[PDB]
Protein backbone atom coordinates (compact mmCIF):
# COMPACT_ATOMS: atom_id res chain seq x y z
CA UNK A 1 0.00 0.00 0.00
CA UNK A 2 2.48 2.48 1.44
CA UNK A 3 4.51 0.21 3.85
CA UNK A 4 6.81 -2.54 2.89
CA UNK A 5 9.83 -3.46 5.10
CA UNK A 6 12.79 -5.80 5.01
CA UNK A 7 15.33 -6.55 7.54
CA UNK A 8 17.89 -9.32 7.13
CA UNK A 9 19.36 -11.06 10.07
CA UNK A 10 22.24 -13.57 10.63
CA UNK A 11 20.40 -16.58 9.35
CA UNK A 12 17.13 -15.58 8.14
CA UNK A 13 15.39 -12.82 6.14
CA UNK A 14 12.20 -11.01 7.47
CA UNK A 15 9.58 -9.25 5.32
CA UNK A 16 6.56 -7.24 6.31
CA UNK A 17 3.64 -6.42 4.01
CA UNK A 18 0.57 -4.11 4.62
CA UNK A 19 -2.63 -5.79 5.56
CA UNK A 20 -4.88 -3.01 4.25
CA UNK A 21 -5.90 -2.12 0.76
CA UNK A 22 -7.18 1.41 0.40
CA UNK A 23 -9.28 1.88 -2.67
CA UNK A 24 -10.60 5.41 -2.74
CA UNK A 25 -11.87 6.78 0.36
CA UNK A 26 -12.82 3.23 1.66
CA UNK A 27 -10.44 0.72 2.94
CA UNK A 28 -12.27 -2.26 1.44
CA UNK A 29 -10.36 -4.97 3.39
CA UNK A 30 -8.08 -4.99 6.50
CA UNK A 31 -6.50 -8.42 6.18
CA UNK A 32 -5.08 -9.34 2.81
CA UNK A 33 -1.64 -10.72 1.90
CA UNK A 34 0.77 -8.99 -0.47
CA UNK A 35 3.29 -11.76 -0.58
CA UNK A 36 3.47 -14.87 -2.60
CA UNK A 37 6.17 -17.68 -2.50
CA UNK A 38 8.19 -17.85 -5.64
CA UNK A 39 9.97 -21.04 -4.45
CA UNK A 40 10.18 -22.95 -1.02
CA UNK A 41 13.07 -20.63 0.30
CA UNK A 42 12.13 -17.49 -1.57
CA UNK A 43 9.32 -15.12 -0.70
CA UNK A 44 8.59 -12.09 -2.68
CA UNK A 45 6.77 -9.21 -1.10
CA UNK A 46 5.32 -6.52 -3.46
CA UNK A 47 3.53 -3.11 -3.12
CA UNK A 48 2.47 -0.34 -5.42
CA UNK A 49 -0.22 0.94 -7.61
CA UNK A 50 -3.27 -1.31 -7.39
CA UNK A 51 -4.31 -3.46 -10.33
CA UNK A 52 -0.71 -3.85 -11.57
CA UNK A 53 0.47 -5.50 -8.21
CA UNK A 54 -1.95 -8.46 -8.16
CA UNK A 55 -1.29 -9.83 -11.63
CA UNK A 56 2.43 -9.02 -11.64
CA UNK A 57 2.94 -11.11 -8.56
CA UNK A 58 1.32 -14.14 -10.14
CA UNK A 59 3.36 -13.93 -13.34
CA UNK A 60 6.79 -13.94 -11.54
CA UNK A 61 5.43 -16.80 -9.47
CA UNK A 62 4.52 -18.66 -12.61
CA UNK A 63 7.80 -18.40 -14.42
CA UNK A 64 10.03 -19.11 -11.46
CA UNK A 65 7.95 -22.09 -10.30
CA UNK A 66 8.32 -23.36 -13.95
CA UNK A 67 12.08 -22.98 -13.92
CA UNK A 68 12.42 -25.02 -10.81
CA UNK A 69 10.35 -28.13 -11.86
CA UNK A 70 11.89 -27.98 -15.31
CA UNK A 71 15.39 -28.18 -13.96
CA UNK A 72 14.56 -30.36 -10.84
CA UNK A 73 16.39 -27.95 -8.68
CA UNK A 74 15.15 -24.86 -6.83
CA UNK A 75 16.59 -21.58 -8.27
CA UNK A 76 18.88 -19.53 -5.99
CA UNK A 77 17.59 -16.05 -4.74
CA UNK A 78 20.33 -14.43 -6.81
CA UNK A 79 18.95 -15.87 -10.05
CA UNK A 80 15.35 -15.17 -8.92
CA UNK A 81 16.05 -11.47 -8.23
CA UNK A 82 17.67 -10.95 -11.54
CA UNK A 83 14.58 -12.32 -13.24
CA UNK A 84 12.14 -9.79 -11.73
CA UNK A 85 14.70 -7.03 -12.68
CA UNK A 86 14.54 -8.25 -16.32
CA UNK A 87 10.68 -7.93 -16.41
CA UNK A 88 10.63 -4.45 -14.89
CA UNK A 89 13.01 -2.89 -17.39
CA UNK A 90 11.15 -4.18 -20.27
CA UNK A 91 7.81 -2.85 -18.96
CA UNK A 92 9.02 0.77 -18.70
CA UNK A 93 9.83 0.63 -22.47
CA UNK A 94 6.54 -1.10 -23.10
CA UNK A 95 2.97 0.01 -23.53
CA UNK A 96 1.84 -0.12 -19.94
CA UNK A 97 4.52 0.47 -17.21
CA UNK A 98 4.02 -1.94 -14.26
CA UNK A 99 4.42 0.10 -11.12
CA UNK A 100 5.28 -2.83 -8.91
CA UNK A 101 8.30 -2.69 -6.73
CA UNK A 102 9.41 -5.81 -4.84
CA UNK A 103 11.51 -6.93 -1.93
CA UNK A 104 12.77 -10.46 -2.59
CA UNK A 105 14.25 -12.23 0.39
CA UNK A 106 15.52 -15.72 0.15
CA UNK A 107 17.76 -18.02 2.02
CA UNK A 108 20.42 -19.11 -0.57
CA UNK A 109 20.83 -22.65 0.40
CA UNK A 110 24.15 -23.06 -1.51
CA UNK A 111 25.89 -20.14 0.12
CA UNK A 112 24.10 -20.76 3.36
CA UNK A 113 23.82 -17.00 3.92
CA UNK A 114 20.43 -14.96 3.91
CA UNK A 115 20.23 -12.43 1.11
CA UNK A 116 17.79 -9.50 0.64
CA UNK A 117 17.29 -7.70 -2.69
CA UNK A 118 15.32 -4.48 -2.96
CA UNK A 119 14.14 -3.76 -6.51
CA UNK A 120 12.37 -0.44 -7.40
CA UNK A 121 9.79 -0.12 -10.04
CA UNK A 122 12.23 1.45 -12.56
CA UNK A 123 14.18 -1.80 -12.25
CA UNK A 124 17.31 -1.11 -10.13
CA UNK A 125 18.57 -4.09 -8.24
CA UNK A 126 20.55 -3.26 -5.13
CA UNK A 127 21.41 -5.59 -2.27
CA UNK A 128 20.81 -3.96 1.06
CA UNK A 129 20.44 -5.54 4.60
CA UNK A 130 17.64 -2.91 4.88
CA UNK A 131 15.05 -1.79 2.44
CA UNK A 132 11.55 -0.33 2.13
CA UNK A 133 9.77 1.65 -0.58
CA UNK A 134 6.96 4.15 -0.69
CA UNK A 135 6.70 7.12 1.71
CA UNK A 136 6.79 4.59 4.62
CA UNK A 137 10.40 4.02 3.39
CA UNK A 138 11.39 7.37 4.82
CA UNK A 139 10.82 6.87 8.46
CA UNK A 140 12.17 3.44 9.07
CA UNK A 141 15.63 3.76 7.31
CA UNK A 142 16.75 6.00 10.11
CA UNK A 143 15.66 3.78 12.96
CA UNK A 144 17.03 0.59 11.37
CA UNK A 145 20.48 2.09 10.87
CA UNK A 146 20.78 3.21 14.50
CA UNK A 147 19.85 -0.04 16.20
CA UNK A 148 21.07 -2.65 13.73
CA UNK A 149 24.01 -4.86 14.60
CA UNK A 150 25.92 -6.74 11.81
CA UNK A 151 24.43 -10.07 12.99
CA UNK A 152 21.83 -11.23 15.35
CA UNK A 153 19.31 -13.98 15.85
CA UNK A 154 15.84 -13.88 14.33
CA UNK A 155 14.11 -13.33 17.68
CA UNK A 156 15.89 -10.07 18.26
CA UNK A 157 15.24 -9.26 14.59
CA UNK A 158 11.55 -9.68 15.33
CA UNK A 159 11.69 -7.10 18.21
CA UNK A 160 13.82 -4.66 16.07
CA UNK A 161 11.20 -4.80 13.27
CA UNK A 162 8.45 -4.42 15.87
CA UNK A 163 10.28 -1.10 16.87
CA UNK A 164 10.03 -0.03 13.22
CA UNK A 165 6.31 -0.78 13.08
CA UNK A 166 5.78 1.19 16.33
CA UNK A 167 7.73 4.23 14.90
CA UNK A 168 5.84 4.16 11.53
CA UNK A 169 2.42 3.95 13.27
CA UNK A 170 2.67 7.25 14.96
CA UNK A 171 4.09 9.51 12.27
CA UNK A 172 2.49 8.22 9.08
CA UNK A 173 -1.12 9.15 8.61
CA UNK A 174 -2.26 6.16 6.57
CA UNK A 175 -3.92 3.09 7.89
CA UNK A 176 -2.01 -0.06 6.97
CA UNK A 177 -3.80 -1.74 9.98
CA UNK A 178 -0.99 -3.91 11.10
CA UNK A 179 1.21 -6.10 9.00
CA UNK A 180 1.65 -9.69 8.06
CA UNK A 181 5.17 -10.63 9.13
CA UNK A 182 6.92 -13.69 7.59
CA UNK A 183 10.29 -15.29 8.30
CA UNK A 184 12.18 -16.79 5.38
CA UNK A 185 14.49 -19.42 6.76
CA UNK A 186 16.28 -22.58 5.61
CA UNK A 187 13.72 -24.99 6.93
CA UNK A 188 10.86 -23.32 4.90
CA UNK A 189 8.79 -20.19 5.12
CA UNK A 190 6.64 -19.46 8.08
CA UNK A 191 4.32 -16.77 9.38
CA UNK A 192 4.92 -15.38 12.84
CA UNK A 193 2.22 -13.30 14.43
CA UNK A 194 3.01 -9.79 15.56
CA UNK A 195 1.05 -7.11 17.44
CA UNK B 1 29.62 25.35 -33.86
CA UNK B 2 30.46 27.79 -36.71
CA UNK B 3 30.70 26.27 -40.27
CA UNK B 4 31.55 27.76 -43.63
CA UNK B 5 32.15 26.39 -47.06
CA UNK B 6 33.73 28.58 -49.66
CA UNK B 7 33.69 27.51 -53.29
CA UNK B 8 36.73 28.66 -55.08
CA UNK B 9 37.88 28.40 -58.74
CA UNK B 10 39.74 25.16 -58.51
CA UNK B 11 37.88 23.18 -55.79
CA UNK B 12 36.11 23.77 -52.49
CA UNK B 13 37.31 24.42 -48.93
CA UNK B 14 35.14 23.53 -45.96
CA UNK B 15 36.17 24.76 -42.54
CA UNK B 16 34.77 24.34 -39.02
CA UNK B 17 35.77 25.30 -35.47
CA UNK B 18 37.09 22.45 -33.19
CA UNK B 19 34.91 23.35 -30.22
CA UNK B 20 32.20 21.06 -29.17
CA UNK B 21 29.61 22.20 -26.64
CA UNK B 22 27.01 20.05 -24.97
CA UNK B 23 25.10 22.68 -22.94
CA UNK B 24 26.69 25.63 -21.36
CA UNK B 25 29.65 23.45 -20.44
CA UNK B 26 32.38 22.82 -23.05
CA UNK B 27 32.60 19.15 -23.84
CA UNK B 28 35.92 19.00 -25.44
CA UNK B 29 38.72 21.42 -25.86
CA UNK B 30 39.53 19.71 -29.18
CA UNK B 31 37.15 17.71 -31.37
CA UNK B 32 37.07 17.19 -35.08
CA UNK B 33 33.86 17.88 -36.99
CA UNK B 34 35.37 17.44 -40.56
CA UNK B 35 34.43 13.76 -40.81
CA UNK B 36 35.05 11.69 -43.81
CA UNK B 37 32.01 10.58 -45.79
CA UNK B 38 34.01 9.24 -48.66
CA UNK B 39 37.74 9.84 -49.44
CA UNK B 40 37.01 12.97 -51.45
CA UNK B 41 33.89 14.16 -49.64
CA UNK B 42 34.03 15.77 -46.15
CA UNK B 43 31.40 17.51 -44.01
CA UNK B 44 31.00 19.31 -40.69
CA UNK B 45 28.18 19.09 -38.34
CA UNK B 46 25.94 21.39 -36.42
CA UNK B 47 22.72 20.84 -34.44
CA UNK B 48 22.67 17.53 -32.42
CA UNK B 49 26.18 16.21 -32.36
CA UNK B 50 25.01 12.69 -31.75
CA UNK B 51 22.72 12.62 -34.88
CA UNK B 52 25.33 14.12 -37.18
CA UNK B 53 28.04 11.53 -36.27
CA UNK B 54 25.64 8.59 -36.69
CA UNK B 55 24.38 9.91 -40.06
CA UNK B 56 27.93 10.27 -41.54
CA UNK B 57 28.53 6.56 -40.62
CA UNK B 58 25.18 5.40 -41.87
CA UNK B 59 25.36 7.25 -45.18
CA UNK B 60 29.16 6.70 -45.16
CA UNK B 61 28.43 2.97 -45.51
CA UNK B 62 25.86 3.42 -48.35
CA UNK B 63 28.03 5.54 -50.56
CA UNK B 64 31.02 3.26 -50.00
CA UNK B 65 28.78 0.27 -51.02
CA UNK B 66 27.68 2.10 -54.21
CA UNK B 67 31.27 3.12 -55.08
CA UNK B 68 32.55 -0.52 -55.04
CA UNK B 69 29.51 -1.77 -56.83
CA UNK B 70 29.71 0.58 -59.88
CA UNK B 71 33.49 0.60 -59.64
CA UNK B 72 33.85 4.31 -59.91
CA UNK B 73 34.42 7.47 -57.85
CA UNK B 74 31.58 8.65 -55.55
CA UNK B 75 29.68 11.68 -56.89
CA UNK B 76 28.97 14.40 -54.39
CA UNK B 77 25.34 14.51 -55.71
CA UNK B 78 24.82 10.79 -54.76
CA UNK B 79 25.71 11.62 -51.17
CA UNK B 80 23.49 14.72 -51.09
CA UNK B 81 20.60 12.70 -52.43
CA UNK B 82 20.87 9.81 -50.12
CA UNK B 83 21.13 12.13 -47.21
CA UNK B 84 18.03 14.01 -48.03
CA UNK B 85 15.69 10.90 -48.35
CA UNK B 86 17.02 9.67 -45.02
CA UNK B 87 16.61 12.88 -42.98
CA UNK B 88 13.10 13.45 -44.51
CA UNK B 89 12.06 9.90 -43.57
CA UNK B 90 11.56 10.76 -39.99
CA UNK B 91 10.04 14.10 -40.96
CA UNK B 92 12.92 16.16 -39.59
CA UNK B 93 12.41 15.04 -36.00
CA UNK B 94 16.03 14.02 -36.47
CA UNK B 95 18.02 17.08 -35.82
CA UNK B 96 21.10 16.63 -38.04
CA UNK B 97 22.48 19.60 -39.89
CA UNK B 98 25.31 19.17 -42.26
CA UNK B 99 27.38 21.16 -44.74
CA UNK B 100 28.59 18.69 -47.18
CA UNK B 101 31.17 19.51 -49.82
CA UNK B 102 33.50 17.52 -52.06
CA UNK B 103 35.07 17.08 -55.48
CA UNK B 104 34.15 14.52 -58.09
CA UNK B 105 34.46 14.23 -61.94
CA UNK B 106 31.28 16.27 -62.57
CA UNK B 107 33.06 19.01 -60.51
CA UNK B 108 33.21 20.79 -57.09
CA UNK B 109 30.06 21.15 -55.18
CA UNK B 110 29.01 22.73 -51.87
CA UNK B 111 25.62 22.01 -50.45
CA UNK B 112 23.59 22.89 -47.38
CA UNK B 113 21.06 20.42 -46.12
CA UNK B 114 18.66 21.21 -43.37
CA UNK B 115 17.02 18.91 -40.68
CA UNK B 116 13.62 18.76 -42.41
CA UNK B 117 15.46 17.85 -45.66
CA UNK B 118 15.45 21.11 -47.47
CA UNK B 119 18.41 21.71 -49.62
CA UNK B 120 20.19 24.88 -50.91
CA UNK B 121 23.18 25.31 -53.06
CA UNK B 122 25.29 28.44 -52.80
CA UNK B 123 29.02 29.26 -53.22
CA UNK B 124 29.16 30.24 -49.60
CA UNK B 125 26.92 28.65 -46.87
CA UNK B 126 26.61 28.33 -43.18
CA UNK B 127 24.57 26.62 -40.47
CA UNK B 128 25.34 26.40 -36.68
CA UNK B 129 25.07 28.72 -33.72
CA UNK B 130 27.59 31.01 -35.20
CA UNK B 131 26.17 30.82 -38.75
CA UNK B 132 25.58 34.48 -38.41
CA UNK B 133 29.00 35.44 -37.21
CA UNK B 134 30.83 33.64 -40.08
CA UNK B 135 28.06 34.56 -42.76
CA UNK B 136 28.72 38.37 -42.47
CA UNK B 137 32.49 37.71 -43.16
CA UNK B 138 31.80 35.36 -46.12
CA UNK B 139 29.65 37.93 -47.92
CA UNK B 140 31.97 40.82 -47.50
CA UNK B 141 35.42 39.52 -48.05
CA UNK B 142 34.52 37.04 -50.85
CA UNK B 143 34.89 37.84 -54.51
CA UNK B 144 33.92 35.77 -57.49
CA UNK B 145 36.61 33.22 -58.29
CA UNK B 146 39.45 32.78 -55.73
CA UNK B 147 42.99 31.45 -55.54
CA UNK B 148 43.75 28.36 -53.38
CA UNK B 149 45.91 30.42 -50.95
CA UNK B 150 43.25 33.24 -50.54
CA UNK B 151 40.50 30.56 -50.16
CA UNK B 152 42.22 29.09 -47.10
CA UNK B 153 42.62 32.52 -45.46
CA UNK B 154 38.98 33.45 -45.89
CA UNK B 155 37.65 30.23 -44.67
CA UNK B 156 39.52 30.31 -41.38
CA UNK B 157 38.91 34.11 -40.98
CA UNK B 158 35.26 33.67 -41.10
CA UNK B 159 35.42 30.98 -38.32
CA UNK B 160 37.93 33.24 -36.50
CA UNK B 161 35.39 36.02 -36.18
CA UNK B 162 33.20 33.08 -35.16
CA UNK B 163 35.42 32.28 -32.09
CA UNK B 164 35.45 35.90 -30.89
CA UNK B 165 31.76 36.65 -31.39
CA UNK B 166 30.13 33.23 -30.70
CA UNK B 167 30.41 31.76 -27.33
CA UNK B 168 29.92 28.16 -28.53
CA UNK B 169 32.80 28.47 -31.13
CA UNK B 170 36.26 28.48 -29.79
CA UNK B 171 39.63 26.69 -29.83
CA UNK B 172 41.50 25.57 -32.99
CA UNK B 173 40.27 25.88 -36.57
CA UNK B 174 40.36 22.83 -38.91
CA UNK B 175 40.34 23.12 -42.55
CA UNK B 176 39.79 20.47 -45.20
CA UNK B 177 40.83 21.67 -48.69
CA UNK B 178 39.62 19.57 -51.55
CA UNK B 179 41.11 20.37 -54.95
CA UNK B 180 39.41 18.92 -58.02
CA UNK B 181 40.93 15.83 -59.44
CA UNK B 182 43.43 15.55 -56.65
CA UNK B 183 43.45 13.97 -53.12
CA UNK B 184 41.84 15.75 -50.22
CA UNK B 185 44.17 17.64 -47.88
CA UNK B 186 42.91 17.26 -44.39
CA UNK B 187 44.89 20.06 -42.65
CA UNK B 188 44.32 19.50 -38.85
CA UNK B 189 44.73 22.51 -36.54
CA UNK B 190 45.59 25.13 -39.26
CA UNK B 191 45.33 27.91 -36.84
CA UNK B 192 45.56 28.21 -33.11
CA UNK B 193 44.15 31.60 -31.85
CA UNK B 194 43.52 30.33 -28.28
CA UNK B 195 46.31 28.41 -26.56
CA UNK B 196 46.36 27.13 -22.91
CA UNK B 197 47.81 29.27 -20.17
CA UNK B 198 50.29 28.23 -17.50
CA UNK B 199 49.24 27.74 -13.78
CA UNK B 200 50.76 30.12 -11.30
CA UNK B 201 51.13 27.52 -8.50
CA UNK B 202 51.87 23.75 -9.13
CA UNK B 203 49.01 21.36 -8.26
CA UNK B 204 49.65 17.87 -7.05
CA UNK B 205 50.55 16.71 -3.59
CA UNK B 206 52.57 13.84 -1.96
CA UNK B 207 50.81 10.48 -1.86
CA UNK B 208 48.82 9.86 1.31
CA UNK B 209 47.07 13.19 0.87
CA UNK B 210 44.18 10.98 -0.33
CA UNK B 211 43.33 8.24 2.36
CA UNK B 212 42.66 4.72 1.26
CA UNK B 213 40.32 2.29 2.94
CA UNK B 214 41.08 -0.89 1.05
CA UNK B 215 43.57 -1.87 -1.72
CA UNK B 216 42.99 -5.09 -3.76
CA UNK B 217 44.01 -6.67 -7.15
CA UNK B 218 41.46 -7.68 -9.78
CA UNK B 219 42.10 -9.97 -12.78
CA UNK B 220 41.74 -8.77 -16.34
CA UNK B 221 43.53 -11.58 -18.13
CA UNK B 222 43.27 -15.28 -18.44
CA UNK B 223 44.08 -17.55 -15.61
CA UNK B 224 46.75 -20.12 -15.73
CA UNK B 225 46.84 -23.63 -14.30
CA UNK B 226 49.43 -22.36 -11.68
Amino acid sequence: MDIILGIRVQDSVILASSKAVTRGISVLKDSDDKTRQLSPHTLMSFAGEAGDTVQFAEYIQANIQLYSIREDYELSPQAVSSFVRQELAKSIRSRRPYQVNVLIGGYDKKKNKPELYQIDYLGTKVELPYGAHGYSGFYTFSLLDHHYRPDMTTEEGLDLLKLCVQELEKRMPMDFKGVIVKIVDKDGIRQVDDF
Amino acid sequence: TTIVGVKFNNGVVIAADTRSTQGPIVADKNCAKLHRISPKIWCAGAGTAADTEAVTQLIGSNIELHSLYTSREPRVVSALQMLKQHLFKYQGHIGAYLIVAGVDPTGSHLFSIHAHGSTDVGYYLSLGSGSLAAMAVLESHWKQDLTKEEAIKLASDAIQAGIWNDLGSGSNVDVCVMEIGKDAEYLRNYLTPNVREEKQKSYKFPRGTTAVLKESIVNICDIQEE
Binding site: - | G130, D166, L167, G170, P206, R207, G208, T209
Partner: protein, 222 residues
Protein backbone atom coordinates in the same frame (compact mmCIF):
# COMPACT_ATOMS: atom_id res chain seq x y z
CA UNK C 1 4.67 37.97 -23.71
CA UNK C 2 7.18 40.14 -21.85
CA UNK C 3 9.58 38.53 -19.47
CA UNK C 4 11.33 40.92 -16.99
CA UNK C 5 14.36 38.63 -16.52
CA UNK C 6 17.10 37.52 -18.87
CA UNK C 7 20.58 36.35 -18.16
CA UNK C 8 23.74 38.24 -18.80
CA UNK C 9 26.13 35.68 -17.22
CA UNK C 10 29.45 36.53 -15.79
CA UNK C 11 30.81 34.82 -12.71
CA UNK C 12 32.03 36.45 -9.53
CA UNK C 13 33.92 35.11 -6.62
CA UNK C 14 34.74 36.22 -3.09
CA UNK C 15 37.67 34.87 -1.12
CA UNK C 16 38.08 36.13 2.44
CA UNK C 17 41.71 36.49 3.61
CA UNK C 18 43.03 36.71 7.11
CA UNK C 19 43.33 40.47 7.20
CA UNK C 20 42.18 41.41 3.62
CA UNK C 21 39.60 40.27 1.18
CA UNK C 22 39.15 40.11 -2.56
CA UNK C 23 36.07 40.24 -4.79
CA UNK C 24 36.86 39.37 -8.43
CA UNK C 25 34.74 38.72 -11.46
CA UNK C 26 35.01 38.56 -15.27
CA UNK C 27 34.18 41.65 -17.28
CA UNK C 28 32.33 39.59 -20.05
CA UNK C 29 28.71 40.37 -20.75
CA UNK C 30 26.57 37.95 -23.03
CA UNK C 31 23.06 37.48 -24.28
CA UNK C 32 22.38 33.97 -25.72
CA UNK C 33 25.45 33.58 -27.89
CA UNK C 34 26.66 37.09 -28.81
CA UNK C 35 29.14 39.04 -26.70
CA UNK C 36 27.77 42.17 -25.43
CA UNK C 37 30.80 43.66 -23.87
CA UNK C 38 34.45 42.64 -23.52
CA UNK C 39 34.83 45.00 -20.64
CA UNK C 40 32.26 46.33 -18.32
CA UNK C 41 33.45 45.97 -14.62
CA UNK C 42 30.70 44.35 -12.58
CA UNK C 43 32.81 44.83 -9.45
CA UNK C 44 32.39 48.45 -8.24
CA UNK C 45 33.96 49.99 -5.19
CA UNK C 46 31.22 51.81 -3.34
CA UNK C 47 33.37 53.42 -0.74
CA UNK C 48 34.47 52.92 2.85
CA UNK C 49 36.29 49.59 1.93
CA UNK C 50 33.08 47.94 0.75
CA UNK C 51 33.04 46.33 -2.73
CA UNK C 52 29.69 45.11 -4.20
CA UNK C 53 29.10 43.13 -7.31
CA UNK C 54 25.53 42.27 -8.26
CA UNK C 55 25.96 39.59 -10.72
CA UNK C 56 23.34 37.73 -12.62
CA UNK C 57 20.74 39.30 -14.84
CA UNK C 58 22.24 42.72 -15.39
CA UNK C 59 19.12 44.90 -15.02
CA UNK C 60 18.29 44.01 -11.52
CA UNK C 61 22.04 44.23 -10.98
CA UNK C 62 22.61 47.80 -12.22
CA UNK C 63 19.58 49.01 -10.36
CA UNK C 64 20.70 47.21 -7.10
CA UNK C 65 24.24 48.64 -7.26
CA UNK C 66 23.13 52.19 -7.94
CA UNK C 67 20.62 51.80 -5.09
CA UNK C 68 23.35 50.53 -2.67
CA UNK C 69 25.61 53.47 -3.42
CA UNK C 70 22.81 56.05 -2.79
CA UNK C 71 22.27 54.28 0.53
CA UNK C 72 25.87 54.83 1.57
CA UNK C 73 25.56 58.61 0.83
CA UNK C 74 22.46 58.81 3.05
CA UNK C 75 24.39 57.00 5.91
CA UNK C 76 26.85 59.80 5.93
CA UNK C 77 24.17 62.58 5.69
CA UNK C 78 21.94 61.25 8.62
CA UNK C 79 24.65 59.60 10.80
CA UNK C 80 27.35 62.21 10.80
CA UNK C 81 29.88 60.73 8.36
CA UNK C 82 30.88 57.61 10.34
CA UNK C 83 32.21 54.28 8.94
CA UNK C 84 29.69 51.79 7.63
CA UNK C 85 30.81 48.29 8.97
CA UNK C 86 31.00 45.28 6.50
CA UNK C 87 28.50 43.46 8.87
CA UNK C 88 26.07 46.33 8.76
CA UNK C 89 26.27 46.64 5.02
CA UNK C 90 25.12 43.09 4.70
CA UNK C 91 21.86 43.54 6.62
CA UNK C 92 21.16 46.76 4.58
CA UNK C 93 21.47 44.93 1.37
CA UNK C 94 18.84 42.44 2.63
CA UNK C 95 16.47 45.27 3.22
CA UNK C 96 16.88 46.37 -0.42
CA UNK C 97 16.03 42.90 -1.51
CA UNK C 98 12.92 42.65 0.57
CA UNK C 99 11.96 46.11 -0.62
CA UNK C 100 10.69 44.49 -3.90
CA UNK C 101 10.62 40.98 -2.46
CA UNK C 102 7.45 40.34 -4.36
CA UNK C 103 9.10 41.26 -7.67
CA UNK C 104 12.30 39.27 -7.24
CA UNK C 105 15.65 40.60 -8.22
CA UNK C 106 17.61 37.80 -10.11
CA UNK C 107 21.01 38.59 -8.87
CA UNK C 108 23.54 36.84 -6.62
CA UNK C 109 25.28 39.71 -4.95
CA UNK C 110 28.63 39.18 -3.16
CA UNK C 111 29.99 41.97 -1.07
CA UNK C 112 33.43 41.94 0.66
CA UNK C 113 35.40 44.10 3.04
CA UNK C 114 36.98 44.39 6.46
CA UNK C 115 35.29 44.37 9.87
CA UNK C 116 36.01 46.79 12.78
CA UNK C 117 38.41 44.09 13.95
CA UNK C 118 40.36 44.16 10.61
CA UNK C 119 39.45 40.51 9.87
CA UNK C 120 38.46 39.60 6.24
CA UNK C 121 34.85 39.12 5.29
CA UNK C 122 32.80 37.99 2.25
CA UNK C 123 29.01 38.16 2.65
CA UNK C 124 26.94 36.41 0.07
CA UNK C 125 23.32 36.63 -0.84
CA UNK C 126 20.49 34.57 -2.00
CA UNK C 127 18.64 36.60 -4.44
CA UNK C 128 15.58 37.71 -2.26
CA UNK C 129 16.77 37.98 1.34
CA UNK C 130 18.95 35.47 3.17
CA UNK C 131 22.67 36.03 3.68
CA UNK C 132 25.61 34.23 5.43
CA UNK C 133 29.17 35.26 6.17
CA UNK C 134 31.27 32.85 4.03
CA UNK C 135 34.94 32.08 3.56
CA UNK C 136 34.35 31.45 -0.14
CA UNK C 137 31.31 31.80 -2.34
CA UNK C 138 31.33 32.06 -6.12
CA UNK C 139 28.21 33.61 -7.64
CA UNK C 140 27.21 33.53 -11.33
CA UNK C 141 27.15 31.13 -14.22
CA UNK C 142 30.48 29.24 -13.75
CA UNK C 143 29.99 29.06 -10.01
CA UNK C 144 29.48 25.35 -10.30
CA UNK C 145 32.94 25.06 -11.86
CA UNK C 146 34.93 27.20 -9.57
CA UNK C 147 33.65 26.21 -6.16
CA UNK C 148 35.01 22.69 -5.68
CA UNK C 149 38.56 23.94 -6.29
CA UNK C 150 38.36 26.50 -3.50
CA UNK C 151 37.16 24.05 -0.93
CA UNK C 152 40.33 21.91 -1.80
CA UNK C 153 42.83 24.82 -1.60
CA UNK C 154 41.56 27.37 0.77
CA UNK C 155 39.99 25.30 3.50
CA UNK C 156 42.01 22.17 2.44
CA UNK C 157 39.03 19.94 2.43
CA UNK C 158 39.53 16.16 2.09
CA UNK C 159 43.29 16.39 2.49
CA UNK C 160 45.50 14.96 5.12
CA UNK C 161 49.34 14.90 5.97
CA UNK C 162 51.24 12.53 3.77
CA UNK C 163 51.39 8.90 4.91
CA UNK C 164 49.37 9.09 8.08
CA UNK C 165 46.34 7.40 6.44
CA UNK C 166 43.95 10.23 7.23
CA UNK C 167 44.69 10.47 10.90
CA UNK C 168 45.77 14.03 10.99
CA UNK C 169 43.98 16.42 8.53
CA UNK C 170 46.00 19.34 6.92
CA UNK C 171 46.19 22.40 9.22
CA UNK C 172 44.96 25.79 7.81
CA UNK C 173 47.89 27.64 6.52
CA UNK C 174 48.02 31.49 6.73
CA UNK C 175 46.65 32.93 3.48
CA UNK C 176 48.80 35.76 2.04
CA UNK C 177 47.42 38.57 -0.31
CA UNK C 178 50.08 37.48 -2.90
CA UNK C 179 49.09 33.85 -2.52
CA UNK C 180 45.41 34.74 -3.00
CA UNK C 181 45.98 36.67 -6.33
CA UNK C 182 47.63 33.64 -7.90
CA UNK C 183 44.74 31.53 -6.86
CA UNK C 184 41.97 33.70 -8.29
CA UNK C 185 43.81 33.79 -11.56
CA UNK C 186 43.97 30.05 -12.03
CA UNK C 187 40.35 29.67 -10.94
CA UNK C 188 39.19 31.93 -13.78
CA UNK C 189 41.57 30.40 -16.38
CA UNK C 190 39.99 26.97 -15.86
CA UNK C 191 36.50 28.64 -15.80
CA UNK C 192 37.26 30.26 -19.17
CA UNK C 193 38.26 27.08 -20.89
CA UNK C 194 35.36 24.97 -19.71
CA UNK C 195 32.34 27.41 -19.56
CA UNK C 196 31.16 29.55 -22.40
CA UNK C 197 30.23 32.64 -20.30
CA UNK C 198 33.68 33.46 -18.86
CA UNK C 199 36.77 34.92 -20.59
CA UNK C 200 37.93 38.36 -22.03
CA UNK C 201 39.29 39.67 -18.80
CA UNK C 202 39.05 39.60 -15.09
CA UNK C 203 38.92 42.42 -12.61
CA UNK C 204 40.14 41.70 -9.14
CA UNK C 205 39.61 44.36 -6.48
CA UNK C 206 41.94 43.98 -3.60
CA UNK C 207 40.51 45.44 -0.36
CA UNK C 208 43.10 46.20 2.23
CA UNK C 209 43.33 48.61 5.10
CA UNK C 210 45.29 50.97 2.90
CA UNK C 211 42.33 51.46 0.48
CA UNK C 212 41.10 49.75 -2.65
CA UNK C 213 43.48 48.61 -5.24
CA UNK C 214 42.72 47.48 -8.83
CA UNK C 215 44.70 44.89 -10.76
CA UNK C 216 43.41 43.73 -14.05
CA UNK C 217 44.50 40.49 -15.82
CA UNK C 218 43.35 39.54 -19.26
CA UNK C 219 42.09 36.03 -19.99
CA UNK C 220 41.78 33.89 -23.20
CA UNK C 221 39.12 35.10 -25.46
CA UNK C 222 36.48 32.73 -26.75
Amino acid sequence: QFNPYGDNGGTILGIAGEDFAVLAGDTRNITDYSINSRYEPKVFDCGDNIVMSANGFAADGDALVKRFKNSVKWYHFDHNDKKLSINSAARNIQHLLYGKRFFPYYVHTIIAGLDEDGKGAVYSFDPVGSYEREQCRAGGAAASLIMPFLDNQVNFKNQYEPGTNGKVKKPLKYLSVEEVIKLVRDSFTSATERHIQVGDGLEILIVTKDGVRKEFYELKRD
